[PDB]
Amino acid sequence: AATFFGEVVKAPCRAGTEDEEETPEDREVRLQLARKREVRLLRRQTKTSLVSLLEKYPCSKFIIAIGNNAVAFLSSFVMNSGVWEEVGCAKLWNEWCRAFCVFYHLKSNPSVFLCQCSCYVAEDQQYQWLEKVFGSCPRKNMQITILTCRHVTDYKTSESTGSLPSPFLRALKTQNFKDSACCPLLEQPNIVHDLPAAVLSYCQVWKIPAILYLCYTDVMKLDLITVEAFKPILSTRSLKGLVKNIPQSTEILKKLMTTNEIQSNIYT
Amino acid sequence: MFLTRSEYDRGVNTFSPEGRLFQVEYAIEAIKLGSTAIGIQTSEGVCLAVEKRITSPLMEPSSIEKIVEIDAHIGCAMSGLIADAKTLIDKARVETQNHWFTYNETMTVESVTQAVSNLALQFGEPGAMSRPFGVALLFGGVDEKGPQLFHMDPSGTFVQCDARAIGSASEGAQSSLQEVYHKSMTLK
Amino acid sequence: RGYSFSLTTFSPSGKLVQIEYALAAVAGGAPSVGIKAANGVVLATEKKQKSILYDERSVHKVEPITKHIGLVYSGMGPDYRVLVHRARKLAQQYYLVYQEPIPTAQLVQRVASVMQEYTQSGGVRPFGVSLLICGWNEGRPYLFQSDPSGAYFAWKATAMGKNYVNGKTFLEKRYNEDLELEDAIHTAILTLKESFEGQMTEDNIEVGICNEAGFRRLTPTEVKDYLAA
Amino acid sequence: GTGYDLSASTFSPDGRVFQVEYAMKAVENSSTAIGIRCKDGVVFGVEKLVLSKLYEEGSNKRLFNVDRHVGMAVAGLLADARSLADIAREEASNFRSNFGYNIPLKHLADRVAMYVHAYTLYSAVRPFGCSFMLGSYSVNDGAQLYMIDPSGVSYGYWGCAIGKARQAAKTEIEKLQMKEMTCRDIVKEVAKIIYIVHDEVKDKAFELELSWVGELTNGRHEIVPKDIREEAEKYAKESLK
Amino acid sequence: SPVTEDLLRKGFSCVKNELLPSHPLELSEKNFQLNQDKMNFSTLRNIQGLFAPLKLQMEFKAVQQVQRLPFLSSSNLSLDVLRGNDETIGFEDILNDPSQSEVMGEPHLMVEYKLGLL
Amino acid sequence: MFVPCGESAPDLAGFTLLMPAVSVGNVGQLAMDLIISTLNMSKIGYFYTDCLVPMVGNNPYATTEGNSTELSINAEVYSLPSRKLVALQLRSIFIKYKSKPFCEKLLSWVKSSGCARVIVLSSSHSYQRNDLQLRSTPFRYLLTPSMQKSVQNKIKSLNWEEMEKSFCIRIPGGGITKTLYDESCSKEIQMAVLLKFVSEGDNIPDALGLVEYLNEWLQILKPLSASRWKIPSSWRLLFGSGLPPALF
Amino acid sequence: RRYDSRTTIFSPEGRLYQVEYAMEAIGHAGTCLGILANDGVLLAAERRNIHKLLDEVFFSEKIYKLNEDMACSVAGITSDANVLTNELRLIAQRYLLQYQEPIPCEQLVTALCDIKQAYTQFGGKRPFGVSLLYIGWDKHYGFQLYQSDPSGNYGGWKATCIGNNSAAAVSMLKQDYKEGEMTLKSALALAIKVLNKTMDVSKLSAEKVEIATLTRENGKTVIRVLKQKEVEQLIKKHEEEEAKAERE
Amino acid sequence: MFRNQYDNDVTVWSPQGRIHQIEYAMEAVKQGSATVGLKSKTHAVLVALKRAQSELAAHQKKILHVDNHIGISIAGLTADARLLCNFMRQECLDSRFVFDRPLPVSRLVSLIGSKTQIPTQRYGRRPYGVGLLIAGYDDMGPHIFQTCPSANYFDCRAMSIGARSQSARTYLERHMSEFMECNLNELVKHGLRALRETLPAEQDLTTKNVSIGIVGKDLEFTIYDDDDVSPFLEGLEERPQ
Amino acid sequence: MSRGSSAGFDRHITIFSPEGRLYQVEYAFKAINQGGLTSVAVRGKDCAVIVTQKKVPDKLLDSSTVTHLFKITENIGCVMTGMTADSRSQVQRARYEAANWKYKYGYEIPVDMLCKRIADISQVYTQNAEMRPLGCCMILIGIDEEQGPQVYKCDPAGYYCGFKATAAGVKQTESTSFLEKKVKKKFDWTFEQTVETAITCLSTVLSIDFKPSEIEVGVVTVENPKFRILTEAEIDAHLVALAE
Hints:
This is part of a larger assembly, with 9 protein chains of 9 kinds.
Chain B: H1 22-29, E1 37-42, E2 45-50, E3 67-71, E4 74-77, E5 79-80, H2 83-103, H3 109-120, E6 135-143, E7 146-152, H4 172-180
Antiparallel strand pairs in B: 1-2, 3-4, 4-6, 5-6, 6-7
Chain G: H1 17-23, E1 71-73, H2 81-98, H3 106-118, E2 133-137, E3 143-144, H4 166-175, H5 184-197, E4 212-213, E5 216-217, E6 220-221, E7 224-225, H6 232-243
Antiparallel strand pairs in G: 1-2, 2-3, 4-7, 5-6
Helix pairs in contact in G: 2-3
Chain I: E1 5-6, H1 23-35, E2 38-42, E3 50-51, E4 70-73, E5 76-78, H2 84-105, H3 111-123, E6 138-144, E7 148-150, E8 152-154, E9 161-162, E10 165-169, H4 172-183, H5 191-206, E11 217-219, E12 228-229, H6 232-241
Antiparallel strand pairs in I: 2-3, 2-10, 3-11, 4-5, 5-6, 6-7, 6-8, 8-9, 11-12
Helix pairs in contact in I: 4-5
């Protein structure tokens, strides 16, 4: 704001037009920053580089979980119905992070490739991520399911946000989705951005089925109530035969939450 | 309908739609750019071990000292920025010596962690500061209640701990400590 | 231009935008003419109170200082009364010590410094005003002009004010030194006539002389006599 | 005129001060309150929007006292209301501390209005968002009522209404004979007014708070005894068909 | 009455006689403008209300912080017509005029003391 | 590129363009949203490029439940095969250091499609106005030196106000308007720029004024008490959620 | 770049841009000589104001007199030099009051450079635009000359030239200075030659230059300014010498 | 999205009219742990909850101490908690030193609100982020006063401001009849049962996550911790369902 | 102040225009008409009658506490026009200044000194970058023992003047033109003539009929220097005597 008395302060922009408009000595700094911030795939087989993930092999289901809560849900519920092997991960240097982006491969029928990536992708690396994960023109038979959690102070309504009920589930489905929805769709005034939006946009523009699931929780730290709230998801053809043991999975989820991850010491 | 670029991290006193004062969170995030440290509380005293990471061989080894005396029975291990830690240490020494002169007895580790945290709480608006103290301390010592080891983070707290790292790769130095701690093992 | 809007920042060529803007503002004001002669000086100006609703008394332009210093503004009306009061206070402050009246030059320097002091600071606008002052010391006449930034000059026939370039061009071919006040007053009246947008009336001229008696201000009927003559 | 509505010390091409008008509008979204003066006294009444039953009577109230013979019926942001009440208390206290007797109502109202105006002149503090009523009573001067708008208005009203439900309240109050009445029927009139203008789709719980000062109490401000309040409540409830 | 809880910079001033006033016209001359302003503020606060002293004193504070740096003479053209001493020349400007100060301090020290950092 | 919604891509032969431009206040975006909502046009395809920040949402034109359940990517097109009108609906901010490739690709698509006219709606900063701009209308216009012989006489008859030179043009807050104008000055591509000075905050009346100013020339609506342009059904919660309880 | 709005912010390469810009202000003032000789210390000047309606004033408009021996010359914004010269006079007199000796050079140049720099570290005040050139004598270091800078980089220069066209004048002075053996008359001739070489070549006159000297004699340092008629014959002699170039 | 320009500071009014910083702080105070605040005719129990940074570390302090007849809880930011309890303690000590009677709660809470009202107006300052549940019995039965991030304090009978607590409010409202005549043990059992609803399913209250604190008629404010809280936490039935 | 000065050529007081005009004070001048009023003050040869306008928004509001004619000293008045919240402060400031002058010099102030003090303390608000130029029209009234009756007007910018007749409000132009036309005809005046002239000017500018109780009149005379306000009876009598 006002650094000192009487200083003229420019009005902060909203659209983003504050950006301004080269000599060789400056010509390289940009490329150094770009190479540091560039995204590369480092599938941990032997310092590999890899061409795209879907080029070497096809698949039918590519469920992706983004966010710590979604990763915990997938690592707790659907892991004991078979054995999974790792195919690769990615490395990122966003200033907000670095915590992994490892994919999973089932030793059974390989149509399922559930992913876990809690890393926060920047606002520009997402397109490169899509380019290096899918490619340019994939098949027209895949089904994509995305599970994410957002803060409750995003839903807009006439009533008070605090007065709103417990965390709930909302869905956004593309045109090419014959299956119905298990929860009411998101209202018009609310929109979603970043990686789930990029995935949904790519799926919509390339004419392949997709489905989006959101959770408007009031707490961002991982817990049991919010992850348990994802129960009604396990009733659709997107993920039906991958669940085989509910109570032991609940017990192992309780044990994982018992680890008491480092919370925030700013509050009490 | 539209996406707009709204920034709330600029400004030391700005509340984000959901709380979580961003400046203090960034100050906490800034700790990891430093040196690792460790401290174990045991029934027969406490122990500390802090790395140095000498830049060049020509630098004299004893020139840099993360370990620093506070009194005859209290020691702490700074991390992160250096000058701010020096200021905090000087204030702590002055405070404990003044208390000894006044009440004519020894310090209690909580009674000095409270003082240093109260000093560090003055971030905000007079030689008053203007930014949070991007530092961290591991106070250690022995008192009438026994041997104690206090942890003080940049924001406001002095939560008691038994073994808690502070430097980079704290996750590796925390999971292993959880796996190895016994609460009854010997000092050796 | 981002480098504008603040008087404490230099544009990346070497200038002060606010100072030049204030100079243009004081240029866009009311014409005024000052003539220095071997016997004395004359200051001539006109007022915007053309309508009969106004009054001749009360508000007035050429306010005397002490007995030998008289000024005239060519800028913002409500923005020089404070400066005039400060000038009178400074004159009296000098008079209590050094029991002899202020010479003109020291007063010019002090008022220039106090005016400049609102340039180098940050957060307050410069004064929009530029004033001539006439003195009579040591058997000599003195004339000076002040600028919004503050830089006194030993001017002789300045016609600063609105359309001052035409006044300067007209005066650069009439003044020839070695003149009495009788011809100087007529020359000043002609200079005002050259750019007035109308005809001079009995209540539009505020000439004031500073001969070796003091700072007598010409009475309206006396101004009528000179205007007719 | 968006663009100039960011600081008090900034005009608009039309000429209005936009922050002041924003503060004006910001007092609307609250409850409602009315106040009437009879021949020999005044009376007020506020629709206290009762929250969940966890609270109880004597909760956050809007019928403060400022002296032994004055009181307000503020309706707006509560923190600023408490600050203004403290300021008025201090003012009356200082006046009685050295000038004897008790402050006349007009002087105190003018002082409080000027103080609440003093903030909208600087780029350092925000203006107060709250309405403000200062009805009181005297022994020889009579019964006087004043209302103070957030910015500067300190007019004297026979009887007005402040808050969200204000236009209907003004229209209904217009049809009264509050120049030859007493303090035993204006209370019932106020109750019937507050129950004839009260939304129910967004409001659920009500608790009328009433207070009068006049010849019936020989110059003292206090809450009405529960018997009269209950009787007025029953009459107003039965009056709605 | 304080204990220590650089002597070259500030030295040679015994504690004995600062808590012992000099010639009785000492507290009425060292602090005169402050006392006059306090009396006027008290009068206005008593007779006109609580708004006037607050407004006037905060105006004083607003206008005070635009002068030149402390190690140079301050013109003080403003704040004077607002104070009311616009033409009240007296024994404050003709005797020991601060422009011709006989002793002068270091610039950085004086400005850092004015900021109150020390 | 231009990815059609259907299997094939319909061809636009000489169609007037209605693409917006990002600027302060999103005045152009709001005005063009109003235009789309009031013309009752329909979507024909999608525009896909790695320049806009990805964002997805429900249907912004959910007039009824028939079309209230659809997705909406950041960039999408619209058309009306009755009077040669097509519009863009950019509704996201630009990723840094990517404006030039997007402008190049859009100009290439404009050249390839062989359209007739292009119209750009944008805004500008209001505080950066010299004294000559105060006692004058804020509405203005700008056209490339290729459309003069066609509609310059009509524009002069409408008595509009031209830009001010320097000697190169420089309009603050354009964002991409200068790029389009400069890379069109050498490619012989004609378009007109109709900006409006505005300040940040609330801009709905300014959007309505810009729409009316554009209609003054295009005559999109009936030639010319205020219920002319239909407000879209998505402009309900402009200022966030409702008032929290017990605050007042 | 954008890191120049306030005089308290560095740059990614590392530089104070505001003071660098202020360094260009002294580039719009008259040139200033001041070569040093064995006996005297000559100091030329330049009068920009050459209008036909200006009356003469005592001690010209550039050369000043500090206490009894030291003079100065200013350049740049003249509105900020009347304060510096006054305060410098004050500091000299204050030192004399402290110690009863004539002031040396350092305890004046450093004293003023302190304030000149202190206005570049407490943002909220623009730095002084000046290029003060100093001169004087003492009993500790003989005759010496100093040249200042708006930021403050005073150096014990032996012959320099501030102001416009400083580069060419300094270079040609460096190429045509007889170091070690130097006389007052030869120094004055060299100064006239330098002034003729620089400037727009108007052949000069008595109404465009000002010369000050510091001849020390009889144990009482004096400062004198050459008369108006004391330089016309000098210019005539220089012109005769230049025309006496023989050649063919 | 028309709020980016009107929320960067605290001294600006939105066109609708509401300070957005106050709403943001009231949303922020919800980060912490639940804290029930039951009361009775003779005693005012104050049961809280404690989080855990890790299994190795120790828990935070949620039940501070003020004086012999008053004890506050905490919820939200732990930074301003100490900065405000210092003012608490200083005012109580001054009231005990000047006069010779315990400072009543009704004036202390008003003073705290008056102090917290200042930062919400001047520039360059931010509202506090505490959720105090001041409790204590002085002369006219125990009181339970709540404090919000805005300087708007409420009187109360029983509430659970803090973390996820709406279910706690519902439970506390369902059984809000027996709290007028019960012994200490029954009231503590009710408080713990009310707190148990906040805790997620398949989770019980251990000995290291409760901080029961009791002040009443003839006993000064004492905080209970560690194994000392076991006798109160014995019956608690067996499970919520 | 930790909020800064808004960037722009007309968004703050301390920034000059490219041509050199203070736009903020011009907005202040335009701000008087926002409230909507009209005030006319005419001086004859032995009287200083002042007329104004009174508008009641509704019926409930009392008619005795809405006056726009305050009293400064024992024999000086004012017809303050514009935003009430700022005139209500300038009146107190002027009263304090008058009391201070009477204490410091021991006699009643000539109108010129009070006008000059108000103008200076209003101008000082147009330099610091923390102030707002409060919009009013400080019109004075009163008699002097050395020059007779006098009428002075002040503006928010700080430019005062001496007028033989003044109109202030939303209809300044036509009222000033009418007064200019009328003054040039006859020179002598009297109390009744001045009151009738003021009433006629107000009626012909507003072009509406004046109810007997719509306009208040405050006057000062040579025989009765004390500032007095005409009651309802006198105003009604003059109104019914007009045009008869």
